[PDB]
Ligand binder design. Structure first.
Ligand SMILES: [Mg+2]
Ligand SMILES: [Mg+2]
Ligand SMILES: [Mg+2]
Ligand SMILES: [Mg+2]
Ligand SMILES: [Mg+2]
Ligand SMILES: [Mg+2]
Ligand SMILES: [Mg+2]
Ligand SMILES: [Mg+2]
Ligand SMILES: [Mg+2]
Ligand SMILES: [Mg+2]
Ligand SMILES: [Mg+2]
Ligand SMILES: [Mg+2]
Ligand SMILES: [Mg+2]
Ligand SMILES: [Mg+2]
Ligand SMILES: [Mg+2]
Ligand SMILES: [Mg+2]
Ligand SMILES: [Mg+2]
Ligand SMILES: [Mg+2]
Ligand SMILES: [Mg+2]
Ligand SMILES: [Mg+2]
Ligand SMILES: [Mg+2]
Ligand SMILES: [Mg+2]
Ligand SMILES: [Mg+2]
Ligand SMILES: [Mg+2]
Ligand SMILES: [Mg+2]
Ligand SMILES: [Mg+2]
Ligand SMILES: [Mg+2]
Ligand SMILES: [Mg+2]
Ligand SMILES: [Mg+2]
Ligand SMILES: [Mg+2]
Ligand SMILES: [Mg+2]
Ligand SMILES: [Mg+2]
Ligand SMILES: [Mg+2]
Ligand SMILES: [Mg+2]
Ligand SMILES: [Mg+2]
Ligand SMILES: [Mg+2]
Ligand SMILES: [Mg+2]
Ligand SMILES: [Mg+2]
Ligand SMILES: [Mg+2]
Ligand SMILES: [Mg+2]
Ligand SMILES: [Mg+2]
Ligand SMILES: [Mg+2]
Ligand SMILES: [Mg+2]
Ligand SMILES: [Mg+2]
Ligand SMILES: [Mg+2]
Ligand SMILES: [Mg+2]
Ligand SMILES: [Mg+2]
Ligand SMILES: [Mg+2]
Ligand SMILES: [Mg+2]
Ligand SMILES: [Mg+2]
Ligand SMILES: [Mg+2]
Ligand SMILES: [Mg+2]
Ligand SMILES: [Mg+2]
Ligand SMILES: [Mg+2]
Ligand SMILES: [Mg+2]
Ligand SMILES: [Mg+2]
Ligand SMILES: [Mg+2]
Ligand SMILES: [Mg+2]
Ligand SMILES: [Mg+2]
Ligand SMILES: [Mg+2]
Ligand SMILES: [Mg+2]
Ligand SMILES: [Mg+2]
Ligand SMILES: [Mg+2]
Ligand SMILES: [Mg+2]
Lengths: 114, 200, 118
RNA sequence: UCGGAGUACAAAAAACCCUCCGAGUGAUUUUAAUCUAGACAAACCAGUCAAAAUAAUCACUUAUUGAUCCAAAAUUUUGAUCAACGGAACAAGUUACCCUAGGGAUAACAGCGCAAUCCUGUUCUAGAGUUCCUAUCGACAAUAGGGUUUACGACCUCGAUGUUGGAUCAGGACACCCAAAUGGUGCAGCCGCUAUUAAAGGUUCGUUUGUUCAACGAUUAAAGUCCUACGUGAUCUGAGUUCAGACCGGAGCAAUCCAGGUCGGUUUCUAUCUAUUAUAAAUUUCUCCCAGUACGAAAGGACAAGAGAAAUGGGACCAACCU
RNA sequence: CUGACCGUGCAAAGGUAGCAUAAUCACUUGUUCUCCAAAUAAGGACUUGUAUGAAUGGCCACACGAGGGUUUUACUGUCUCUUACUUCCAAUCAGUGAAAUUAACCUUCCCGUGAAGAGGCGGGAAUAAAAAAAUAAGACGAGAAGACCCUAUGGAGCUUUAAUUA
RNA sequence: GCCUAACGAGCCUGGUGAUAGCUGGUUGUCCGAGAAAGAAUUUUAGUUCAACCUUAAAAAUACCCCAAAAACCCUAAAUUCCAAUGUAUUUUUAAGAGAUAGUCUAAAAAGGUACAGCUUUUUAGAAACGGAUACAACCUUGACUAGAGAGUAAAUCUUAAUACUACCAUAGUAGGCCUAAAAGCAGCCAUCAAUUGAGAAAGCGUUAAAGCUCAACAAAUUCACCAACAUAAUCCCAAAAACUAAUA
């Protein structure tokens, strides 16, 4: 009996998208925080956005997650319109990641007393 | 008249969820217009031939002046697949032979309103009930409410300290290892497709 | 799948007559648990075997003593169907140095400090 | 090989000859640079982000891609349906003339599992039955069972469980084909048609096919349906399938091949062990009567009782006959 | 009803003379007559065989086959349906004296179970001990590391447009 | 075909201890610790990496883990991540192999026939010398050596199913309408009104009538109603049992 199943190429590995660090994790500058294919979490304070929508930590610190108000860039039109048609009482919210800096910025050392 | 095949025939064979026959029902639990109905006491799959029976039977059995009927169940939307005879396992999913409506225990199949007494309807409804895939009953509002009040009366009259709820929820004797995850909700009254009314 | 399950809080809210029934004192909760292991850790998931290794319950029918703090209570809760728990009682009070050699633990769950005089 | 969904519901991962859509590039302009912290991912190989320091976009956007070696090139780099896509620098058919190593890790036979199909019941009355659901049946449907069919699984056997039909000898089931008691009838009687109870005994001889099946001739009280390794080959037979030779269609350039026909073709065992090696106490016809009476308008036409004959199956026996 | 004719297409030509259900894919136990009480056999016809067919030969015919098939006569133990008697074996006595085979066996039957068919397990039954003679149901009996099937980056023979080529 | 009792290619001696990812074998005692399949592959009867693991070493935290936290429409069991706390484990470094041909049970799903002692993944369990007679996977238990001691664990197999009874029946009027007839009772309309009480009728019945019963009084007594389901092939399958007290 002809057993042809017409479907092809279901097979891909998973991309291991997801959250790499968790709230209250210590982080060094450069660590990737989470990696996603669509924006699930947006970059907050001290979190840089990679061209593939990676989130990495800019400072040395503690990673925090947050629900905050979303005010799209006036250059990006779709989001501008989505913001436009809302009923007059409602604001948009999203989830952000943050780094909270640990090390102080610097120190004043006494080099020489002349 | 319900149509053998849907007007917009499903093109893509779907996985068969046993889960939609399984356990208690949500939709179509309550009466709307009518005084009478056929209540489903098990889960089951209603295909076309059944609709044929309930329809011809219930139409010819009733006085068109004093009585009217209503479908509480959709016309069959779920594709069922077969393979020919003499087929080795594998090669793909088969082709579409059938259409069926899933029916959960505790749902009303047919709703009959009218100025008749429950005795008439009960007289000829018991035939159609008797002929369905699942065990089914002929009921009215009074009957239904009576048996439900009794159904909780049993649970407050229960003389033995041990009920399925208490154990399954407290995971006693590690019983949760033998039970399913759906068992917490069914509270052990439903098992697979079948329903047991006497289970407290 | 099979899982670690859960116990909802209502389970652990005692009724008034449970005090009268198990002879616990309604006013003051009790300090120490005597925990004995009644049943086997075989045929059970690995995490329970773990909990029983931490509690020091390694071999059956030997009593152990534990604090009634919430931290120990959590683990006990996980394995609660394998064990027997009874409140420890001290009629003669707390054992001092001189009594260390004379200690005995009775099946009432009762510690006797002065045992078999002369 | 490569990517999106589902399966895989909320960190990751995750299978199938699973369910569905895609890619082996286009379209632009703005030519999208060096060098180095820390990271994701990961068997490895490949993949990914990226601060500081110097001075690409749209097309669901995610996939648009090939490692060494070896070649050509210039100043530096380009080379693959290597698509069997972790890639052999370059190789196809046949074998019933076959050979070895293995496998019950895997088919054909048989057993087992399951019961789609098949097979016996009941439950429901629309309908047929002129009227009348259920004398005889019965659509759409419900619920139990049986385990012989064709399948499906691959669980025992490949240091062999020898496989179709007959012969002989049969053991068993009862879902009775006869014989025996009976219910119902759209049963007057004669035939009948259905249903209940009953397994001690029976259940033919031929023409054609290897044939079970089937047709057909002639009969019988009937010429049951099955199971037993489709009973039974250390009892028998091989016509058939099933090796070697050979034709005839056909398919191949050929070799060879087609659950297509045809002709021909080795059937081995001295029995170690278990098993086993004769008690009896009938069954069936067909006649003769009854009585051409009971029964029906007549035409056709009974059982029961009682006398006879046979036949078969048990057990024997030679006066005659026949060897 | 068929098609001598008609149109158009493609070919290097368009299968003719014969013969025909055949030692000729299938349908298929083709149709019908003769043959027998009855014939899927045999012979004769019809016959698109859509897969006959003329030196890979086509068609008739003597004469010949230890070739295949069919009928008749006759003959008989093939058979209805077996029987008698002799001889070799045979069994008892006396000599001489092998073979495959064999875990150990103090080696029953039933129904369950079980790697799915039990002398060994479970529940029951039955049961002094040994010879000799028989019969073949079982011991998945004995013989050959299955000739079938599949799998080895195992072989070989054969053939060509396989790839490399003296 | 045949070429010296095996010819698809003789026999012999060399090459030759040919080569077998394939069978088959591999020899004293006693102790420690102990494994189940993620990748690629002329690969799926094999290897080589990872993961687990064994033998040494160096160290520091490891499991458990409350808030807090992880998405946009609907979305369960639950995960991920972390202090306290209960414990002693875990990571690195140096050496090594085997293993990579699994079964069933519970749960979530696919495929198939909402079939398999079926196949394909994910999460758990198991492989008693004790129970389920017998028994690989279910249940009780984890482990040594002696005792002619004790306490217990899982477990021995029970559960049921019935009846229907009086007495009686006139009235307009075969209401209209149809219809061969149509008289409650082929269908439409009406549902009226005598009697104390009787439907412009629920059954059968008739060509239509005719005729049988049900509903209505009158007489009484009342107790119920929700009924059930044939069989297989050697020969049934412990024997038996209502009872001296059991949280045995
Ligand atoms: Mg996917
Ligand atoms: Mg994958
Ligand atoms: Mg039903
Ligand atoms: Mg920069
Ligand atoms: Mg190249
Ligand atoms: Mg490859
Ligand atoms: Mg590959
Ligand atoms: Mg890859
Ligand atoms: Mg040949
Ligand atoms: Mg061989
Ligand atoms: Mg096998
Ligand atoms: Mg056989
Ligand atoms: Mg088979
Ligand atoms: Mg067998
Ligand atoms: Mg069955
Ligand atoms: Mg099957
Ligand atoms: Mg398998
Ligand atoms: Mg074999
Ligand atoms: Mg053998
Ligand atoms: Mg017999
Ligand atoms: Mg019978
Ligand atoms: Mg018989
Ligand atoms: Mg046989
Ligand atoms: Mg045979
Ligand atoms: Mg034999
Ligand atoms: Mg030829
Ligand atoms: Mg010959
Ligand atoms: Mg032959
Ligand atoms: Mg023989
Ligand atoms: Mg003998
Ligand atoms: Mg013999
Ligand atoms: Mg005789
Ligand atoms: Mg011609
Ligand atoms: Mg032919
Ligand atoms: Mg030709
Ligand atoms: Mg020629
Ligand atoms: Mg020719
Ligand atoms: Mg001549
Ligand atoms: Mg000659
Ligand atoms: Mg001749
Ligand atoms: Mg002798
Ligand atoms: Mg013996
Ligand atoms: Mg069995
Ligand atoms: Mg047996
Ligand atoms: Mg002898
Ligand atoms: Mg024998
Ligand atoms: Mg044996
Ligand atoms: Mg045999
Ligand atoms: Mg072999
Ligand atoms: Mg080969
Ligand atoms: Mg080779
Ligand atoms: Mg020779
Ligand atoms: Mg060697
Ligand atoms: Mg390769
Ligand atoms: Mg291999
Ligand atoms: Mg921690
Ligand atoms: Mg396997
Ligand atoms: Mg392997
Ligand atoms: Mg079973
Ligand atoms: Mg596991
Ligand atoms: Mg035992
Ligand atoms: Mg011990
Ligand atoms: Mg009248
Ligand atoms: Mg009145």
């Amino acid at each position: 009996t002809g057993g042809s199943s017409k479907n092809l190429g279901g097979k891909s590995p998973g991309k291991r998208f997801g959250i790499k660090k968790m709230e209250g994790h210590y982080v060094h500058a450069g660590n990737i925080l989470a990696t996603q294919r669509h924006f699930r979490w947006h970059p907050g304070a001290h979190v840089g956005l990679g061209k593939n929508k990676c989130l990495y930590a800019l400072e040395e610190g503690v990673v925090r997650y947050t629900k905050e108000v979303y005010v799209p860039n006036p250059s990006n039109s779709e989001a501008v319109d989505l913001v436009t048609r809302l009923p007059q009482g409602a604001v948009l919210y999203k989830t952000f990641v943050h780094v909270v800096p640990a090390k102080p910025e610097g120190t004043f050392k006494l080099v020489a007393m002349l | 008249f319900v149509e053998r095949v849907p007007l917009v025939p499903k093109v893509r064979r779907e996985r068969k969820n046993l889960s939609d026959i399984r356990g208690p029902s949500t939709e179509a639990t309550e009466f709307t217009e009518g005084r009478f109905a056929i209540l489903a006491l098990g889960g089951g799959y209603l295909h076309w031939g059944h609709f044929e029976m309930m329809r011809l039977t219930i139409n010819r059995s009733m006085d068109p002046k004093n009585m009217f009927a209503l479908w509480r169940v959709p016309a069959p939307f779920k594709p069922i697949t077969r393979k020919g005879m003499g087929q080795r396992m594998g090669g793909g999913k088969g082709a579409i032979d059938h259409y069926v409506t899933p029916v959960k225990a505790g749902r009303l199949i047919v709703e009959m309103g009218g100025r008749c007494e429950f005795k008439e309807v009960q007289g000829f409804l018991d035939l159609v009930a008797h002929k369905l895939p699942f065990p089914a009953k002929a009921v009215s509002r009074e009957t239904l409410e009576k048996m439900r009040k009794d159904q909780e009366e049993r649970e407050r009259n229960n003389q033995n300290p041990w009920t399925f709820e208490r154990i399954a929820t407290a995971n006693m004797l590690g019983i949760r290892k033998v039970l399913s995850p759906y068992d917490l909700t069914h509270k052990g009254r439903y098992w697979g497709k079948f329903y047991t009314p006497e289970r407290v | 799948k099979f899982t670690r399950s859960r116990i909802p809080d209502k389970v652990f809210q005692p009724s008034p007559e449970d005090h009268e029934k198990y002879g616990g004192d309604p006013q003051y909760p009790h300090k120490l648990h005597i925990v004995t292991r009644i049943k086997s850790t075989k045929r059970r998931p690995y995490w329970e075997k773990d909990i029983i290794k931490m509690l020091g319950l390694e071999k059956a029918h030997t009593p152990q003593v534990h604090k009634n703090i919430p931290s120990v209570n959590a683990k006990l809760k996980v394995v609660k169907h394998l064990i027997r728990i009874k409140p420890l009682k001290l009629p003669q009070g707390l054992p001092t140095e001189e009594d260390m050699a004379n200690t005995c633990l009775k099946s009432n769950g009762e510690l006797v400090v002065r045992w078999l005089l002369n």
